[PDB]
Amino acid sequence: SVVDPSLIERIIRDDVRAMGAYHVPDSHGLVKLDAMENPYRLPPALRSELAARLGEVALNRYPVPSSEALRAKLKEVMQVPAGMEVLLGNGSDEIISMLALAAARPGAKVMAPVPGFVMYAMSAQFAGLEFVGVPLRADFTLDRGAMLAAMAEHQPAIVYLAYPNNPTGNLFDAADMEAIVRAAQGSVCRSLVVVDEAYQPFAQESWMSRLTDFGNLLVMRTVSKLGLAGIRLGYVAGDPQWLEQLDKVRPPYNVNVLTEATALFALEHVAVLDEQAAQLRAERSRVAEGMAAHGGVTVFPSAANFLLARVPDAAQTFDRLLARKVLIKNVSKMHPLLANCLRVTVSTPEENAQFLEAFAASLQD
Template identity: 60%
Template structure:
């Protein structure tokens, strides 16, 4: 790097940004890829052909227009949007998280979330110049109600995030505790339902009871991680305020059309989710039978498992061409934990065999 470039970076790039690590994505070519909670299934050939023909007719020479409104309407129908509620779109949930931080960046504002949790809550807060308050979960990965209530009373956060189910622990928090935290929150509460297709319950049924709660979802776990589409719903007056900071045309016409196509064929994605839920149960049973391995209950398309030596097991499995996620350094509660994505039956067989061989 030249001295000129070093000078420019030192002078004009924020010091906290220079000190940060970027979001790490593991190389996965040639691997059984079970590290990122993706839906492992592609569309059947007939649907792939139909989607290709449909996308070929999209006017990519024009900015996104009324078709985005069609997508909002389709999603509203899909979730059963309550009366008086609005819905906004994001380029994945990540963009919505960033937009929320931008919209709530009043002097002295902070964002609060349980830890371990989704890393983007903290990253978006810090990039926007907001304080981030992380409240550790209990040892059983349940919300620490007393600690959450105390932290909210002390810091008065603008936003409280509750992932439902949580990432990377994969559990649904106790509903009674969630409700007491929601009731006590001084600002917005965002219920992040990224893994809703695999969960036994949703907060959508309760959201209409509250005027300060937003529910955020994504089509990534639905089966469309590649198109980057998230959405958020809540009282229309609140959604309208946050929507003001959304960049114009943030969702492409191709992404919108692919999402509309998927919603029209949601029975296929429901079929895929049913297989993954069944495979999740099979995986948990197989992991439970392995010496020294403790899988935790899951309501997502991932399983958190505590193992004798996470770093060594991760490396051994990678050498056997099975890629999982070593989360053991993310938080002390995750010591010696791996996060395993639920794959196809064939991929899960390979993961089980690789783990057995690596442990031996």
């Protein structure tokens, strides 16, 4: 090796080098419950129908998925209110970046609760805008007064609210959020408020209908990738006066055809996707109950496909789980309020049962 390690130290962000193995190698029997992903596969009948449709779209056998058709289907399926426009993207990150870029005015700031979605290189993930993180309460609830005070002091351009939040899992108090949306219209500050529902499972309480009630609100979501890897379709709904501006800063590339065809298929099989969501809800409860039954464990409330839990010793529990071929996410070092916290992704019944046993054993000192 002819690498100069001091050059790597100089070029790569300290927070990127600080992080440990974001991806660990796929060994024999390793159960991964560390990533934002849905382990559930479709029924064989739907799997082969999707494989057929994507294969045909790949080989130019089936027709091109029209963006106008995909947007129209989203509006219908997602009950986008009358008068509101939908804008498509390559995942939620592109849409967040487009938003930040559209608002990249001299001195523009982005404000979001912390610990929150963008856990590293925040300003970088918000087109160079200054990031202002407002701590959530110790129990991860949104601190209305703290948000309002920071809003008054800092005068942000954009307020981002993850609904549910990553890594904490919780849906913030709806009243507190409405107060924030109204405050940002002028009385406290002047901001676009973006409710990010990217970690929200299908057929759940959405802010989509609140687009009718607030002129400074945008609601962003994603469509399932249906276990084929790749890029989830991202989308943002809101008033044409906001979206028409946002669409001018799109990167020099469109949304790829497989993502569009896959998202279309997802939208056309909502009954099946509702079934998965229900099965995951039942499994999340069993996993939460199992973890919660132990001494010194706090399982925090969750509306997501993952659970955050505080344990006596996260570093120790992580290693002991990995020693039993179970990989979860240690979020302990990402923020002071996440001290001794692990984030477990809800998986299949078989994998959940393996996690629960390994978790129970790892906690014994």
